[PDB]
Amino acid sequence: NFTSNFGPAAHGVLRSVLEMNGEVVERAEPHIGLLHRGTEKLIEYKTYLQALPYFDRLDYVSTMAQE
Amino acid sequence: ASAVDASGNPIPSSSVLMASSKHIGIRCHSENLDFLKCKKKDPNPEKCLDKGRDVTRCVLGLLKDLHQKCTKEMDDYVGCMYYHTNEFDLCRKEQQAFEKKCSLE
Amino acid sequence: YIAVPAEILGIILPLLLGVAFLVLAERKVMAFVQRRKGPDVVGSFGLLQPLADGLKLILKEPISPSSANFSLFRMAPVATFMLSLVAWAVVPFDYGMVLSDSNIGLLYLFAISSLGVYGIITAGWSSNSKYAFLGALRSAAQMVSYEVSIGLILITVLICVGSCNLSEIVMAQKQIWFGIPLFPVLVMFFISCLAETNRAPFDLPEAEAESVYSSMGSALFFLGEYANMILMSGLCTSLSLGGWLPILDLPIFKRIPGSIWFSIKVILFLFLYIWVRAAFPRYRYDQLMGLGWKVFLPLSLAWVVAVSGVSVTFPWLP
Amino acid sequence: MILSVLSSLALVSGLMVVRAKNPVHSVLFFILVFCDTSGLLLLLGLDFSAMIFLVVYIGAIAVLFLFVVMMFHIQIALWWEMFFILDNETIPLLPTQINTTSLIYTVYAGKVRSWTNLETLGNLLYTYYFVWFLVPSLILLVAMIGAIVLTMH
Amino acid sequence: AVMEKLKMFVVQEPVVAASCLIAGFGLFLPAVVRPILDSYQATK
Amino acid sequence: ASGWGITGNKGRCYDFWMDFSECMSRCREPKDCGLLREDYLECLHHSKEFQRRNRIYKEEQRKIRA
Amino acid sequence: MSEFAPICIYLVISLLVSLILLGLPFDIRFYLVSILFIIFDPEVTFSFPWAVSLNKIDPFGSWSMMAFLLILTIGSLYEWKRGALDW
Amino acid sequence: LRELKDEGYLRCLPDGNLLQTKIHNIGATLVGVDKFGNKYYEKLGDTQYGRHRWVEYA
Amino acid sequence: NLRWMEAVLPLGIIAGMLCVMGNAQYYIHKAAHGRPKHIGNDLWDVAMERRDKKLHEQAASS
Amino acid sequence: ALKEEKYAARRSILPVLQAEEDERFVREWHKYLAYEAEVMKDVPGWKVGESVYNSGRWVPPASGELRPDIW
Amino acid sequence: MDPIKYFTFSMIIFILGIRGILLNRRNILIMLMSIELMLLAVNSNFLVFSVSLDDMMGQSFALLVLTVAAAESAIGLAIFVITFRV
Amino acid sequence: TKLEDEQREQLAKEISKDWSSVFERSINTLFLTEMVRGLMLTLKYFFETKVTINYPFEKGPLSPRFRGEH
Amino acid sequence: VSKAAEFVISKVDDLMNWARRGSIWPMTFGLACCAVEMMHTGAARYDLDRFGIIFRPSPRQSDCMIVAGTLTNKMAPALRKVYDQMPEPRWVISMGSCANGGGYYHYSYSVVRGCDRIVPVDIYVPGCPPTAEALLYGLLQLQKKINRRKDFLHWWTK
Ligand code: SF4
């Protein structure tokens, strides 16, 4: 079983690691901490009307359902 | 590509030979054919020389007789045979002319 | 003695000009398809874009590789380049307007395609990492399968007309274009030419290499690919669409130099390449090779049989 | 001249095939042997067989050999006779061939048409001698079913 | 039953069906048409 | 040699083989016409011809020393 | 011949121009596919002479070639049902 | 001729954009000129919504 | 309305090149031998070319 | 039809070319024969003509260097 | 002299191939490539003979032996690739 | 996976009712009519006009409720 | 100075700078929402290819690096390793407001206060996210920077 990496369109930043076998993905596993900010810590050291933009920033495609 | 040899000599110049081959086949033919039978019997370049000399004489006589009766036309006809090295399908127009003024048979 | 190198230079340089403007026009027309303009700043109409890209890739600070740094890495791109061009040797642009009348031209083109396969496989393996090697193997297998399909198609078009040198073929078409009766054969030949250079719907080898190196080396490689593209287009229009022959045979068309007709047909096929590129998603590798070995081989073989049959029962076969 | 060039290249390349290590080097020199042999055949005046040597010998067999030796890259576990045949005095001394060079007798009658070797070979091989052409079908079939039964689990 | 099986197979594998039909056409034309044409040419 | 010359004509050395064959199979008398075998094999290899021309040149050269 | 001389001069000139351009900045799947290609490539090799000369051979030529094709096609069918070209 | 051709016309040949703006001009009208010398045009009509007001920078 | 012509134009250049390409060698050969190339020279035409050349040189020298 | 026109023209023009080249060959072979006889006078005479190939069938000289009529 | 040169080239290639198949005993790849070389030399002298004495069957034999060589090479490399799985 | 064999049969026994249906579907998948339809749509968009706002001379639309340099 | 030769040098620098500015090839680093807007720049409206700009993915043949998004202490080494692997002439455009100067999460752990600390940013940009117009104007500012790049003169005087 090979151990291939996948660090790539611009479909986000994500680190897939793949236990492989021929052309079969026997086990895929993502590493995800690659874009962290501490949004919860900030909200706390922040407020309500001041923390609304954080929710605006989460899931930045659908930018209003969060608010 | 001249076909005149600065004199009366029609200078075979294979282009001219083909241009007349459209026409030669009906003048020396029977005479001509005897040559081949010689070459069929024994391909000996010695014992088949008389008939070949005869054919060459007949053909040069044809070329002399035919270059004077059609001169201008024939000139341009060979003028369009050296060019287009030997393709009959090209400039058929000249061929047409070479059957109106020139000797048809 | 000296005329021959002059002809060779006159064949080589315009091909490079044309292939640079080919990649330029590729970007432009795909853009127009996608409701946008292409490169339109540098030149008057973007015409100075390929020259600028070339000058950039020239002044760019080079980086020599670290893998068999001579006679095996700095050679294979040159190998595929030489193969593409030496294929370009025997192609008729007009009556007698050729470089060499190699009386078996078709076999020549087929052999040169296989040698291009050699070029790509050795260029892939000459690197260090192994994923490039797996990609090279994949591309080799794809190329060779669609080559056997191209071979059978060539056999069809050859059955339709006795000799092999391409001028004789274009006369046979001068009667009536072989694209008309063998239209499905033309479609299959075009799909096989698409798969042969990995262009429009068959790209997963290259896509994976981009998903997981010299500047001038990569430039030479892309140049070889696009040159082979123009070559495939050229022989497709030289043995399935007429090859410098006016349509409808009316003596107003006969003022066009004939050479113009060949350029118009090959530019149309280039436009079709670029068009079919920007309309379709890509196959996988599994389905790619499956279609190669299941859909085009049997169809091409059946077409050989059928055309031979129809042309052997009636006295239509020269 | 060029004949000697191709012969020398083929000779030395075969030597390297047998002796040189790094079996991929051997396969490269083998491809080179076949390439120069094809050029040689082209010099001989048989064009079809030259292109065939290119297509099936080089483009088909040697690519298989290259494939296989690729996947297992880590698997690294006469002058007397020449004089005796050149001192026979049954070979024309090149001085003789000079004047006789202007002695050949063209026929101009067997070349009014001209069969390229491809055409005549097709004629002969398919009309007559056809069983000689059916048998190779069987040996190719044997090849393919053998590959299957051997390696395909 | 056999017609149903054949319709099933043709829907499932269209390109093999088309290839076989083209090969059948190309093999049926000579074998059964050439004698008829030779006889027609003999009579006229 | 059979007939199929390398360009669609009766091969260069056929007629001799035809005479050899008709004589060897028609009149089976013992090797009375093995005389034609030398001829046919000569056509195949020109051995006698090359030998003769070589000797002519040999004597031409030998008379040069004088 | 006398055309492969232009061919080879083209070869060397292309070598020169390519070097000039270069110097300016200064498993079983694969194996079985290769075998099937080696088997179907002599098929094209044999179809080439058969193609040119289908006028000096009557239906005898067409039929012999179709028999060859049928033998190799049964080969292809055995290949297919075994799934060696599945990928 | 050559005066304006050198002033604001021949630069289009290696500038590109100026050619597109010259075409939009041959379709255009005039609506303003600003002290920096630059000319604001408006080709209002059946053209489009995004491209009917633009500026030649002078 | 000719916006499409902006895309064919680059492609169109290719056409030019190709045409030029061909024509180049053509005219080159036309000046290197005195007449355009001939497609499909069997042995007959080569022998005829040699014989014609020799005959014409004999006529010119005389 | 076109190819047949061309081939018929060639066939009809054949004999002139054949006879001319035959005469050329006789000239050259007579030259070579006179040369031989001149360098083979005092040697025990062996039929200067010397048809090495017996039983007629003139069999052209056919020098070495196989395929001479190509290159 | 040219038939002599062609035939001596073919013979020396044949000798080289047989020396390869004899001396080198373990490397199966060199072994099979030497067999290919032997068949190549046979093919080449077949063709030289087909053109020297004007006769055609040399070339039919050449084509068929090409088929034979392709078959042997394919099947033998199969034998090897199954030997080197273990 | 036994059901899949049973499902694939009925799904074939359903669409293959008559001969017209099988013939239509076969030459449908054999002459690439959906490919042709996609190509024609693409070519229409090619001939059609563009957007390409041509920035440095005609900028994009905004709104008085914009946010930027303070 | 050989005033003629200085004029030839000026023209050579002009040609070189024109090529390098008209064939520029970026390299995206799409961490956060600015990537979206960057796509909108590369989209049909404010077309980028029109300026001779192709988003080449492999960092062995690119010219610029567009850091669009928000760095992270986990992501800094990857960004630095990508930056090192580029050829000599390089530029960096810092899109967004946290790729330059920390921005919002500036006041938070696990965030690099601006990509200036890792790679030597060339021109940043303002925005949250920068309007596609603003990003395109940033790239045109990069063109204006690379346009005053007299280089052959420097080598002729060095
Ligand atoms: S405002 Fe800044 S930190 Fe937030 S998504 Fe945008 S680029 Fe990222």
Numbering used by the authors:
A (entry chain S2): 10 to 17, 21 to 79
B (entry chain A8): 2 to 106
C (entry chain 1M): 2 to 213, 220 to 325
D (entry chain 6M): 1 to 77, 97 to 172
E (entry chain A3): 2 to 45
F (entry chain S5): 2 to 67
G (entry chain 3M): 1 to 26, 57 to 117
H (entry chain AL): 21 to 78
Give me lines lifted from the publication on this model.
Complex I (CI) is the main energy-conserving entry point for electrons into the mETC. CI oxidizes NADH and reduces coenzyme Q (CoQ, ubiquinone), pumping four H+ per two electrons from NADH. CI is an L-shaped multiprotein complex, with a membrane arm and a peripheral arm. Across the studied eukaryotes, mitochondrial CI is composed of 14 highly conserved ‘core’ subunits that are responsible for electron transport and H+ pumping, and 30–35 ‘accessory’ subunits that are involved in CI’s assembly, stability and regulation.
Here, we present a cryoEM structure of an ~800 kDa assembly intermediate of plant mitochondrial CI from etiolated Vigna radiata (mung bean) hypocotyls at 3.9 Å resolution. This assembly intermediate, CI*, contains the intact peripheral arm (N- and Q-modules) as well as the PP-module and γCA domain, but lacks the PD-module. All the cofactors necessary for the transfer of electrons between NADH and CoQ are present in the CI* intermediate. This includes the flavin mononucleotide (FMN) in NDUV1, all seven FeS-clusters of the main electron transport pathway (N3[V1], N1b[S1], N4[S1], N5[S1], N6a[S8], N6b[S8], N2[S7]), and the off-pathway FeS cluster N1a[V2]. The loops that cap the Q-tunnel at the interface of the peripheral and membrane arms of the complex, namely the NU3M TMH1-2 and NU1M TMH5-6 loops, are disordered. Core subunit NU2M in V. radiata CI* contains three N-terminal transmembrane helices that are present in yeast and bacterial complexes, but lost in the metazoan lineage. Based on unambiguous density for key non-conserved residues, we were able to definitively assign the three different subunits of V. radiata CI* as CA1, CA2 and CA2L. Therefore, only one potentially catalytically active interface with all three Zn2+ coordinating residues remains in V. radiata’s γCA—namely, the site between CA1 and CA2 at the "top" (most matrix-exposed periphery) of the domain. Additionally, we established that the γCA domain is membrane-targeted via two amphipathic helices that contact the CI membrane arm and through specific interactions with lipids in a lipid-filled pocket formed by core subunit NU2M, accessory subunits NDUX1, NDUC2 and plant-specific accessory subunit P2.
